[PDB]
Symmetry: D2
């Protein structure tokens, strides 16, 4: 999986072709203020290390807020940020500044995808791809925190199980902790280059459907390669771009009916 | 990777079956105890149900999603319609007796098969099961029998190469009778697609995400799909009767999840409000 | 307006009971078939359950809302949602499902009575016989409510349970001689519900009001803490909320399922 | 009898308005600041919306329940039909709105939130100091940019032929939310339950706006402001062949707002759902 220079004359073309083949695209030298991202990591790490985080227990109805690890206990805790949702006062400015900058970049990347789609694929998009996410109510910024392992606790081979994203596209800065991998056509796992300043973008199931399979939603995971430090906290900031529910993806589905169908496949009551 | 048809009746069928599941996520049994004629009668009478406008009297309950789901509600239309049958749920009077008799028989077999899976797990895997596998599904509220119907393609409707897209099941195990319509395929470790033998009298079992979790990845939940191979008659209806065995939500799967907290996290992962 | 205790065994009890429902939304029966000693045993063992650490292993399932709900900002009651299909502690299962069946059997009889004494013109509005609406109903709920004792410097308010109407078909509740339950009268006053040991209280809910075109009213009710209610005692109650199948046709305008959906839309639930 | 119409312009209006709410759960304002012709423009174009089959393109989203809700017809086992007497549209700033209607309806939403915010200031100002102290944050802050606040556009279609109009159009109910705000249009029938069990008529002239306390403000104010039962009857003379449009705006607090020692808005709703037996 090759890292592409956002500044390069041919970057758009190579980026979308990366998406078409692998389902993923990696960009270095991107326009999102890198010092803003590190500021964000620091202050959210403080937040997760604080007792005050429990004041923001997620709302039962809408699932915006803080989700603690916990009987049974998961190995991550997280926070769901929505522009419309509950956000702590002292973290609001930065996180929404990032949210907006990430959306704007996503919107540009969606233009690129549409530009370099063949005419027979372009013709299947009910509206232009960037419009599908403009002021999307469902777009979610997930602040993920994996805490240090304490004492006896043993770290697994796999940190995040293999999976496909359901949404349109997902945007994630890396933090130079290798482990993210994507499924290749031949059953092997390709390592996503995760140097500082890279941003990783991937196709989710709804753009796969909108494109009639042309852009594939690829299974991906995060492993713990040999010599990963069990005592370090890992924070990550994935942004899941969702289309408006009423967007017609194909002759078979709208975004809303595609989601409901998934809910029935999973047997959710 | 090959997918072998195991004769249920054979003295060593349990060990081979559980080993097939361990390697591929799937197990195929012939000469199984479920009455083949019951199943045929079920296809005939539900085919008739889907071919009547009276099916619309059974529009699914909005609260609990039991009942009839049509292909359609400018406008958009899926290539299938289906019915969600639960013992507790709405079922048409004329179809109740047979479909629930099938539900019981398929549950009783699934229950035996889970005994097999436990028996032939190594001690260090057995030891991760919070309760015996069969107890996870006994009288399960969530176990879903889906009656799936792909209607005839009409006029100049075109048939895609893929009927049901690559997916994994989330639940514990899923049990499906075949009916000599090739197409169901399972993902091999080398990125290729294996055909599942689909002769009359075969029943197909597969590992779901919750049993992968419970076994610490020892039994894999494998990607599968249904293609429309060359010669598939676009004008023929297809009915199928998949049974999705769900553990009780309070089942501890592992140090990390109950069945309930596993499903909840899936929903947060998908961005469901 | 007054609320009369009607002896279930009386020759004319059905007629009087139904007229009580029509006039007030409520009927009170004494000498009913449910064994007092079962109910006593249920109170006793569920009290112990709530007054234990064991309860926290039965935290309600997030998806289907069956199981235990702690007070856990802090409410003044905790409770358990019991369904025949749902989670139930092993040690409590047999008695509580025994009670569930007996209370359902009695509810079924009481629904026959209600239908029998409805005028023809009201009978005609019932899409199916009233008892069939609840036979093997997935949604019927047995709620076990526990108000714990006041601890230390906590004050006990005048109203234990705020004025409300039930949404369902009918609701069935044994009393254990703790006065406080009240029903709103037509003149705006509150009528005390006689709550002697051995009484069972039945009331019309909104869906049976709809199904009967207003003929049987779903009446506002509340529970107060009268003067000298002992703040240091627990209270347990066993309300059974009988819910029609979602697909039951209540009227020209609603099924049970669409009635509920309309209520969620009115409440602004996303 | 009737509730008092209070002229917004009068100097003592605020004081008398808050007292009407305390006494009856409701307040009626005339000559309010919301442009009369905006409200008329909205009635007109939404009536138009419901009078077309193009509305069906905006079928509500199943996940989030924003959009258009038809009165679907279904047929039963005995050849009866089930069909509500109203269809409606749920408008949220974040939700789906038809392009041709967005500007006016969001301008109205903004303007009505502004009035409701002033009215909540009024409610706080004239609360006694002991009641003021029960509000965890200022009342207006509870609804500022609230995600849950809902503008529900209701349409009762004409009946023709032998179709019967019932004596009751909307059943007696309470609002769960903080406050609700409703312009009227000279269609009598909205009533409020008085303390002695009788029904009070609400003066419903054009240019009136009706405001009522909801359960969450009753809870926040420890019963000082009552959430009162109201209904809509079809009084003698109501013409069944006429459409009726109405625009109630339900102001909901942020979920995380603490209402009392016992509930947040979120835990209060969850409790209602559990009491209702919603799975
Ligand atoms: Cl939308
Ligand atoms: Cl359970
Ligand atoms: Cl999924
Ligand atoms: Cl039903
Ligand atoms: Cl005046
Ligand atoms: Cl909030
Ligand atoms: Cl309610």
């Amino acid at each position: 999986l090759e890292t592409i220079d956002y500044r390069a004359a041919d970057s758009a073309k190579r980026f979308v072709e990366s998406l078409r083949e692998t389902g993923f695209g990696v960009l270095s030298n991107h326009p999102i203020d890198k010092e803003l991202v590190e500021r964000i990591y620091t202050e959210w790490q403080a937040f997760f290390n604080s007792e005050a985080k429990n004041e923001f227990m997620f709302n039962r109805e809408t699932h915006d807020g803080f989700f603690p690890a916990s009987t049974v206990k998961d190995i991550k805790e997280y926070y769901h940020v929505y522009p419309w949702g509950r956000i702590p006062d002292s973290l609001r400015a930065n996180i929404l500044a990032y949210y907006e900058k990430a959306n704007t970049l996503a919107s540009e990347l969606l233009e690129w995808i549409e530009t370099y789609s063949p005419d027979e694929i372009k013709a299947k998009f009910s509206i232009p791809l960037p419009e599908m996410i403009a002021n999307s109510h469902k777009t979610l910024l997930r602040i993920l925190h994996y805490p240090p392992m304490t004492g006896d606790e043993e770290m697994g081979a796999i940190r995040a199980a293999a999976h496909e994203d359901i949404n349109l596209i997902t945007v994630l800065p890396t933090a130079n902790e290798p482990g993210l991998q994507v499924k290749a056509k031949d059953g092997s796992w390709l390592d996503v280059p995760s140097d500082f300043g890279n941003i990783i973008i991937n196709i989710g199931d709804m753009l796969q459907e909108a494109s009639d399979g042309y852009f594939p939603s690829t299974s991906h995971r995060v492993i713990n390669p040999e010599g990963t430090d069990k005592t370090k906290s890992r924070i990550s900031l994935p942004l899941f771009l969702h289309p408006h529910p009423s967007v017609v993806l194909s002759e078979r589905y709208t975004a809303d009916s595609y989601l409901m169908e998934r809910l029935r496949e999973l047997g959710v009551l």
